[PDB]
Amino acid sequence: KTEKVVNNGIPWFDDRGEIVNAHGACIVEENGRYYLFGEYKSDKSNAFPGFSCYSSDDLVNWKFERVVLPMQSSGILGPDRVGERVKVMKCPSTGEYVMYMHADDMNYKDPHIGYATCSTIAGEYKLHGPLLYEGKPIRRWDMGTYQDTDGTGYLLLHGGIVYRLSKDYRTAEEKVVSGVGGSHGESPAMFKKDGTYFFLFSNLTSWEKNDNFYFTAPSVKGPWTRQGLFAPEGSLTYNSQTTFVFPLKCGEDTIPMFMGDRWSYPHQASAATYVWMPMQVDGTKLSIPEYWPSWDVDKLKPVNPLRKGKTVDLKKITFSKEADWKVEEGRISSNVKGSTLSIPFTGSCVAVMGETNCHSGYARMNILDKKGEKIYSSLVDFYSKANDHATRFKTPQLAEGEYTLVIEVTGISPTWTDKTKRIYGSDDCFVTITDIVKL
Template sequence: MKKIILFIALCLVNLRLYSQYKEFHPGEIWKDNKGIHINAHGGGVLYHHGTYYWYGENKSENSNNALVGVMCYSSQDLYNWKNEGVALEVSDSKESPIVRGCIIERPKVIFNERSRKFVMYFHLELLDKGYAAANVGIAIADSPTGKFTFLKNSRVNAGKYPLDMTKEQKESTSTVADFKDWWTPEWRKAVEDGLFVRRDFMGGQMSRDMTLFVDDDNKAYHIYSSEDNLTLQIAELTDDYLNYTGRYVRVAPGGHNEAPSVFKKEGTYFMITSGCTGWDPNAARLFTSDSIFGPWKQHSNPCNGDGADLTFNSQSTYILPVAGKKDAFIFMADRWKPKKPSDGRYVWLPIKFENGLPVLGWLDQWGLNVFN
């Protein structure tokens, strides 16, 4: 009888832990069902069959490198999250591109209706190579919680030029070696005209900070920071989401954007990004377009109020559509803590709209009823 009572008491404690939140508290410790701060940084969320799945980087107390892999958490209400374990494990084999100690960042997962497979993309840097590889990694699973199987890694669209690059730009003989000094007006103009696209043409375009977006017609797109983080690119995926069709475009060439997050509302595509200041926050940027392939128009910082100039001390990672609520979107961002990476915090804020454009304001706490 004592064992039964103890078991019931433990179940009640676990239930209390798992249902402890009734609203969001941006920037604060966010505990999972085990009472541990959620470890899913630079993440994204998949909604599948009534459940949300949050994927993100597992960070250790002392390192930003991938020592564990990609985590998965599940939730029905978006407030309370169950730790589903490691969705994609790093390898112990030094022959593997995802060997323990490599860099895995910003994992995103989408579901392919045709193959019934869950497909994960992530920014991958090879062990002990710094950020030189600038690869995309791809993994696949039969279940949203994994285990995901690593398939391959590469740069993007080798041997292909962007759809929006002119004949003159493609045939230019200007090379990186022509510019002794960077950041000059002449160098910037060369970058805008495809200097780094031509440099990386044969080996493929660089892919760092990234997200995935599935459109209304189930066409999927990989959006990533490329050209030494100077230009965003949007690349169309094949129907199985495992390869590229070769169709891609450049967004804000030379604009120095990273951390892209994309959503669609009433036929308009919105993209919120950040500037490039390492682990330090900066002002968010907003772009809109009537087509995923552009042209994209830049607008002013979508953040308002105190802390707006630093995106409330955070950096964008994903825009989450709330299931069952029309035009309800959550801005997901990270507060990086490079000296103690596992303590990084999450800033989730509701997106409001003014004059047809998204607006972000700080809230100490809030609930999904703000969308009603």
Template sequence: MYKLTWAVVLLTLYYTTTIRTTLARSTRYIVPGATWRDTDGEILSAHAGGVVQSNGTWYWFGQNERANITDTFSGINVYSSDDLTNWRYEGQALSPLNGTAIAPDLVVERPKVVYNEPADTWLWFHSDNSSYGLLKQGFATSPNVTGPYTFQGAITPLGGTSQDFGLFKDVDGVAYAMYSNGDAADAHDDLIVRLDANFTGPEELVYTFFDWDLEAPVMLRTEGRYYIVMSHKTGYRYNNVEVYSAETIGGPWSSGSYIAPAGTRTFNSQSTIFFTIKGSERTSYIYGGDLWNSEDLWDSRYIWLPAFPNDTTGGLTIEWHDLYTIDVTSGEFGYPEGTRYEAEHGVVSGDAAVVVQPNASGFKLATGLGNGSVSITGITGTGNPQWVSLHYHNHDALWGDNRGGNNITLARYATLSVNGLVHTEKLRQPSGSTGFVLTQTVNVTFERGGGNEIRLEGWNGTLAADLDAIVVYGDIYEDEN
């Protein structure tokens, strides 16, 4: 019995260690819109987040959203990384506390963090009730950047209201809050407010974007200008994020422009984070946004893309890449090439057909993927996990940034099969504007060599998005040959 018990213990330790080592493999790429996992292999949950850097380590804070959670607020998570690609879960920075403004039935969202060395680290957030009638700002402190944070209170800033919230710390150490003042008829403004020297509260209104009616503010500073990006108030409908710039934070601020092609609705993202990577070769920037999934919030994704501010024109643009690398030492981006397989060269069945589309890569795509399918064969695989990008066309949603807009389809759904087996039964395909091909990237393991197949069809008889092409990239993990 003694030997058997120790054998079981050793076997358990072996398998636990083996599984954890497998899950903790280092990934090569940042993959916008794909399921992102932490170094323990768990789905990374840091929505509407903020980031702070210290001693070469980035800390990413965000809302905890998990499957089967019914509480409105279930905590703020924090992750750490030294390469912006692989993130380690550090635990909950802030947890619900009954009887306070961070109770489970209340709203705690858009967490942002600033240092106030040598005193505490400050965590600020939008504080509200489920009907969004309180419109406050909450804050918590910790002597450690990873927490746990102690809730300190919630305020009405400068005696007014506050909705979506952002935070920016300038190079001189001064911190600024940015927020919308609400949805009331007399509250469609966006504000920049300076915090006091100890970051304990707002001190002075610095600038007002009168009647701008925008939300989700995030700020970036270059050598020459400040940039603030904000999204429109369209609920869970994606919209065209705007950018404004100024030489000083007090303005005057420029006229606005979009940061991405209008029909992409900022590649179906809402602004939340900017990263500045000061490398030996160049200073680079990454825009971070949330790809919300209103049906399953826990499955909301992240759209992180290279950002390019232009101090001459005052504009800022982001570029789509299916996946990319960032060298945090040099500051250089890397864009790997994949192998493209056009859908028009595939085999269609049922109601599916190949039709012309002037904006598709081969000027054709496969459509009618409801009671029909398209199969792409002859795909070469490595036998290891690979990223495969589906380039699709879903034109269901109405274009525009106006409020309202009922009866808009936010997404179509497809079933994806690999080599005859269902890989993803219900693959969500967010909508876009007519003529714009969007991208969705999934983790697939093919058999080694040629002869692999991908089939796409409508989920449960519903209409899937049109398929333009698939692009197959190399191995996901660093330890693969």
């Protein structure tokens, strides 16, 4: 049984049983398959760890293709460089796949929009260095791409700068939009629906999430009118940062799918998650009025299959030092480093629900087998600026057997800062579990 459920904010696993690691991503459809390109993040540093590519035939069950562009031996994507927001477009006139990214140094003080090419969608791309405008590098940061209906290709940048690309997609010929609404927005994304062009941006709050906003226009060139938020106020774009908007076909119509990153600085490799949602469009009005933590991609409606399994009585799970846990009806929490919950299970899928808040930290999910040896371990981020109650983790597939799920309070409180010297993130290291469901 191939599942069709997108579970927002929880790690996903590929064919290899590995965490799907493609952040600041986009998706490109080709021959009945979807190709997800993104940053193949490391938990060790923010340094460029390569751009990954996954594919699927349903937008849910991802297969690892390869690291489509790895760290280089020198240059803008070499050692001690940052590589972010990879985007790929198929150049119509040449059939070539051209990849674009924001390359930089570790302090974000040496920005370069770069490009790479490949003759196949998921092949080994070849970096060509800076994407040149007027024969000089484009020294800018967050970027996106848009491919218009006539085949014209565009490079999108923070602030609402837009460059028309050459017919071969390898040169930035003309800056067709120099800025939108005197803005200072980042993580740009663009799409078109019913003759209306939509330009999305996030506010500058580092890895912290904020209420993203958008503009509309009758053409890519403008004029651009400010429209405000496209997701409910205070939701912080459902605790994500815009990355892309992918056209989802359903019958003779298409529905835009919003894609956002629920970053988890610093342990991004294991704990950064995704927030995808169908968007509603009525003329220049864009919205995602209701959050769906789980939704059926074929049916475009929310579902709650994770709650269909048998509940584990929280009063009966094994605690290492039960005094470390604050126990209530349907909720247990702790900030004591090292304390754990252990739950035996039969390899069948197990879902862990809980609450995220501004006082929470990372939990470490371990799966032990019969002999007691650890066969799985990853970090899950319980920090969130705004409170959330939902599934936090689902075990990867295992053959019918003899296992133990161990949930450990790591005591790692996620915090970060930026050039403004502002401190973001958590003030504590709590982990709060509300339900453990054996499917």
